[PDB]
């Protein structure tokens, strides 16, 4: 019967758990015990970016460590010149519930998305000189949560319909549809080689996907509430997942273990953003307690508690060259840390 | 600075001026989140993923937001509604079968962590099928709800001119079943405003206006530590 056929998953999961336990030989904490401790890190706010009118929900860095784009509920995308605190573009959106923003790794395209079930993609440079929507990306039966550009023609979007999609910009159609998540997929991050990407949904699971051929390679679990933010390792063989259970966990692709968990007994809030510095051993995780807390990735402990945000921080990302870290919060402010 | 920088700073100042103009509009419109369920009466009150309905009472502007194709999980997208003036909740109140589901929905939206300072404007919409089903013996609240022995006799009430005594004594049970779960928490942070209305009602947008005025009045009084 259907129950008899579905029962095989029980022993399959038992076998995979046994294999995972067998592959475990030494935790990361023991391996990095004798490494030189990271010096006391002090980051001070260098620039604050005012101008947004509502809670900032997403930010993304351009591939020059100079331009960043932010989205807020007033219905406007603002592109900032971080070095000079200058506003480059202010794009009013049709929908006023955007919760994701993407910067193409060329400087030509910016993609938004929210409760409109549409991933609008805009032309930054035009013969008309004004930013216009290249074409709306309909096809999702739920709110979008994360969009990440593959190339100037391919984009990968995660939505609330428990489905991630690969879109061809020219045809405006879902080239590939990823399925398997059992919940509102909230975050996805790409690898340095743009062939693999991970996803994070509300089933407290992380799924590894192949861009070209679809298909899910490995599933990652260990979280207790959900995953609100994900980020690949700079090397590309690991990733750290945010959550609402006050735990950040880093998983290794080559082993599928949970190498370390980043959590302090005095933290009960949720993580909304995670990113890595340009060495690997610095995991920056935003927190709901109006703060962002810097963790040493190798030795699971605390190295920085930089603060100054009035409301919860929602977005965070390190530049490509590791120059600075930008944090976005619900107080309509972006702050650059160095 | 240089010539290009002095021309990029000026362009940024135009954006700030435009952002200032939209600020005046943004803080002058009171966003509302219309919630409820299927076959509850959203379309009657009103007449992709989200549908905006903009109406204006007196001189103030309102921005209603009705969710569409969103899955049956309000979590992870209700966080976007924290600056909303109020939440419009529509209950059919005449089904008499999916009323415990409405009660659970109201409890979930009232006890949500993010919706701690957000009031709920209750619209017990379509109090006409209720009258036609109470006048007839088909649907009695006693069967579905085994707590009608007390009957929720109204110590205070404002019945419309011309009303069956059972009609005005069974609808207040519906109102009390919601006010009981509304008053069980909050601790004065936010309050519920129940109303009785039909499918077609000209005086439906005015109730929203009055409730929103009361909500912001309560919010302003708490800033002076007078409440």
């Amino acid at each position: 019967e259907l129950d008899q056929l579905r029962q095989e998953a029980e022993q399959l999961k038992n076998q995979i758990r046994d294999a995972r336990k067998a592959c475990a030989d030494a935790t990361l904490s023991q391996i990095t015990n004798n490494i030189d401790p990271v010096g006391r890190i002090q980051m001070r706010t260098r620039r604050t970016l005012r101008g947004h009118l509502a809670k900032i929900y997403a930010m993304h860095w351009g591939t020059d460590s100079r331009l960043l784009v932010s989205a807020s509920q007033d219905g406007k995308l603002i592109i900032w010149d971080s070095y000079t605190t200058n506003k480059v573009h202010a794009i009013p959106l049709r929908s006023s519930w955007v919760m994701t923003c993407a910067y193409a790794p060329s400087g030509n395209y910016v993609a938004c998305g929210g409760l409109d079930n549409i991933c609008s993609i805009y032309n930054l440079k035009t013969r008309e000189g004004n930013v216009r929507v290249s074409r709306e990306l309909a096809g999702h039966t739920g709110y979008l949560s994360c969009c990440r550009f593959l190339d100037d023609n391919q984009i990968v979007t995660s939505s609330g319909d428990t489905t991630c999609a690969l879109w061809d910009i020219e045809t405006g159609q879902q080239t590939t549809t990823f399925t398997g998540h059992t919940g509102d997929v909230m975050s996805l991050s790409l690898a340095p080689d743009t062939r693999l990407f991970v996803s994070g949904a509300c089933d407290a699971s992380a799924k590894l996907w192949d861009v070209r051929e679809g298909m899910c390679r490995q599933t990652f679990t260990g979280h207790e509430s959900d995953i609100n933010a994900i980020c690949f390792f700079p090397n590309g063989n690991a990733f750290a997942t945010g959550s609402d259970d006050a735990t950040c966990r880093l998983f290794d692709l080559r082993a599928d273990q949970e190498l370390m968990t980043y959590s302090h007994d005095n933290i009960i809030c949720g993580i909304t953003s995670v990113s890595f510095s340009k060495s690997g051993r610095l995991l920056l995780a935003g927190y709901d307690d109006f703060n962002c807390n810097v963790w040493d990735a190798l030795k699971a402990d605390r190295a920085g508690v930089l603060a100054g945000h009035d409301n919860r921080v929602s977005c965070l990302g390190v530049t490509d060259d590791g120059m600075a870290v930008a944090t976005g919060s619900w107080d309509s402010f972006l702050k650059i840390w160095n | 600075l240089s010539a290009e920088d002095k021309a990029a700073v000026e362009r940024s100042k135009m954006i700030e001026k435009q952002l200032q103009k939209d600020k005046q509009v943004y803080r002058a419109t009171h966003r509302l989140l219309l919630l409820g369920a299927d076959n509850s009466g959203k379309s009657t009150i009103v007449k992709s993923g989200i549908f905006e309905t903009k109406f204006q009472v007196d001189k103030v502007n309102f921005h209603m937001f009705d969710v569409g194709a969103q899955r049956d999980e309000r979590r992870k997208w209700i966080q976007c509604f924290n600056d909303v003036t109020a939440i419009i909740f529509v209950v059919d109140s005449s089904d008499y079968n999916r009323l415990q589901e409405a009660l659970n929905d109201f409890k979930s939206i009232w006890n949500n962590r993010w919706l701690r300072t957000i009031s709920v404007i209750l619209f017990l919409n379509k109090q006409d099928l209720l009258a036609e089903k109470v006048l007839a013996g088909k649907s009695k609240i006693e069967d579905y709800f085994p707590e009608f022995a007390r009957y929720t006799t109204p110590e205070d009430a404002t019945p419309e001119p011309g009303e069956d005594p059972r009609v005005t004594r069974a609808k207040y049970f519906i109102r009390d079943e919601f006010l009981r779960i509304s008053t069980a928490s909050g601790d004065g942070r936010h309050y519920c405003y129940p109303h009785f209305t039909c499918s077609v009602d000209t005086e439906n947008a005015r109730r929203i206006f009055n409730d929103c005025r009361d909500i912001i009045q309560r919010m302003h009084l708490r800033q002076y530590e007078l409440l």
Partner: single-chain antibody
Amino acid sequence: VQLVESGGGLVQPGGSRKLSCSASGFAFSSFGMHWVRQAPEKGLEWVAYISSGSGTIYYADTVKGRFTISRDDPKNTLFLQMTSLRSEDTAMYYCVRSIYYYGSSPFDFWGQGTTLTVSSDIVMTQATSSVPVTPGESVSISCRSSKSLLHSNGNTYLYWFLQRPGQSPQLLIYRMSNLASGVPDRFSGSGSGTAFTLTISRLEAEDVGVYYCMQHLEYPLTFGAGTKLEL
């Protein structure tokens, strides 16, 4: 993108006149355009510049306080009204659109112009005003800057231009390195803070013409003689 101007014609000296453009192709509000002069046989000469919102007004030494400039945004039309004229003002007044943010391409598009036959600064030199070339070979025009154009920001603010005979100028190289849109990838340029060279690899047809060099550091905004490339 399109611009067409009107107002040209023979006028006696001292006769105040005005001319206007028609930018009915793009967004006039976000672009700050200029006026560029060009004598029958001479180089270019920047005239004025009106920014977005008509907030910043700039002029040249020979045109300061003379050619009042105005912008009519609702009608998408740029104005430059001139008072009593002199014999010097005998140059076509080309219209050039320009935008300014990080990554912009100022002087991206040019109109067609208009003739007005009327009966200290950063001086730059364009040596070898006539260089012979052949198809398939390569050339190297050179231009120099009395003062270093390498600002502390890290850019260089060098602009290269081309004007085919009987045609409006087009932008090729901006900030000494970046290639403008719509031009072949064979065009390239580099140089130090004082020395500037432009290399045209794999010469082909339609490249025969005159090429210009101008500064965008500082605003007296100046040009060069114009190296004519002929077969």
